[PDB]
Design an enzyme around this catalytic site. Structure first.
Site, short mmCIF file in Angstrom:
data_model
loop_
_atom_site.label_atom_id
_atom_site.label_comp_id
_atom_site.label_asym_id
_atom_site.label_seq_id
_atom_site.Cartn_x
_atom_site.Cartn_y
_atom_site.Cartn_z
N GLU A 169 0.82 -1.21 0.00
CA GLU A 169 0.00 0.00 0.00
C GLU A 169 0.86 1.26 0.00
O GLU A 169 0.57 2.21 -0.73
CB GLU A 169 -0.94 0.00 1.20
CG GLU A 169 -2.14 -0.94 1.09
CD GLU A 169 -3.19 -0.52 0.08
OE1 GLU A 169 -3.14 0.62 -0.41
OE2 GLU A 169 -4.05 -1.35 -0.26
N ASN A 181 -7.16 8.98 -5.55
CA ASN A 181 -7.90 7.99 -6.32
C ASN A 181 -8.79 8.68 -7.35
O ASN A 181 -9.05 9.89 -7.28
CB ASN A 181 -8.76 7.14 -5.38
CG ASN A 181 -7.99 5.98 -4.76
OD1 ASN A 181 -6.79 5.84 -4.97
ND2 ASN A 181 -8.69 5.15 -3.98
N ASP A 203 -11.92 8.72 -7.92
CA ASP A 203 -13.23 9.22 -7.54
C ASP A 203 -13.17 10.52 -6.76
O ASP A 203 -14.23 11.02 -6.35
CB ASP A 203 -13.99 8.15 -6.75
CG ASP A 203 -13.43 7.93 -5.35
OD1 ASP A 203 -12.37 8.48 -5.02
OD2 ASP A 203 -14.07 7.20 -4.57
N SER A 238 -11.21 10.66 -4.35
CA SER A 238 -10.79 10.43 -2.98
C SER A 238 -9.28 10.27 -2.95
O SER A 238 -8.63 10.08 -3.98
CB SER A 238 -11.47 9.20 -2.40
OG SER A 238 -10.94 8.01 -2.95
N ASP A 277 -6.03 8.33 -0.63
CA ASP A 277 -5.58 7.31 0.31
C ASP A 277 -4.39 7.84 1.11
O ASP A 277 -3.43 8.34 0.52
CB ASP A 277 -5.13 6.04 -0.42
CG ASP A 277 -6.22 5.41 -1.27
OD1 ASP A 277 -7.38 5.47 -0.89
OD2 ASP A 277 -5.87 4.83 -2.32
N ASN A 298 -8.82 5.53 3.32
CA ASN A 298 -9.44 6.28 2.24
C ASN A 298 -10.46 7.28 2.77
O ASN A 298 -11.37 6.92 3.52
CB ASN A 298 -10.14 5.34 1.25
CG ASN A 298 -10.89 6.10 0.20
OD1 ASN A 298 -12.09 6.37 0.33
ND2 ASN A 298 -10.18 6.53 -0.81
N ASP A 317 -15.55 -4.56 9.44
CA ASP A 317 -16.83 -4.15 8.88
C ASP A 317 -17.45 -5.18 7.94
O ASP A 317 -18.55 -4.93 7.44
CB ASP A 317 -16.66 -2.82 8.14
CG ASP A 317 -17.88 -1.92 8.27
OD1 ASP A 317 -18.30 -1.65 9.42
OD2 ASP A 317 -18.42 -1.49 7.24
#
Ligand SMILES: [Cl-]
Ligand code: NA
EC number: 3.2.1.17
Length: 129
Positions: free
Chosen positions: A35, A46, A48, A50, A52, A59, A101
């Site tokens: 990562e 990213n 969209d 967004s 990281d 994110n 989650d």
């Protein structure tokens, strides 16, 4: 902070990630290599839109607040900047929430694609245990 491999493992072991929700320490060290290349200050955009952040590329859509991602839940209650610390507590508290989650570590595309299905003990070879 650019961590050494075994240096990171000891820090993650001390925060209890070992077999947290059933993932051996090596999975977590492997997720960070790829990562972030073990770098706490890491950031990547990213598509969209967004971003990281931190040593596990947490994110901003769903998980922290960076002041530029529409439509952010900040399900961890935190500023994304704070995840770039040298110190990894905020990142490890939020990572524990993510992996719970639903989808486990598959929440990390890099884990899926490069750690999963491998001997992820190589990632803690040579570490004081
Ligand atoms: Cl799982
Ligand atoms: Na958010």
């Amino acid at each position: 902070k650019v961590f050494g491999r075994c240096e990171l493992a000891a820090a993650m072991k001390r925060h209890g990630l070992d077999n947290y929700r059933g993932y051996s320490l090596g999975n977590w060290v492997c997720a960070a290599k790829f990562e972030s290349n073990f770098n706490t200050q890491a950031t990547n955009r990213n598509t969209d839109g967004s971003t990281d952040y931190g040593i596990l590329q947490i994110n901003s859509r769903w998980w922290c607040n960076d002041g530029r991602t529409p439509g952010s839940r900040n399900l961890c209650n935190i500023p994304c900047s704070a995840l770039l610390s040298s110190d990894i507590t905020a990142s490890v508290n939020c990572a524990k929430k993510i992996v719970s989650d639903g989808n486990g570590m598959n929440a990390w595309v890099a884990w899926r694609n490069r750690c999963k299905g491998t001997d992820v003990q190589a990632w803690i070879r040579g570490c004081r245990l």
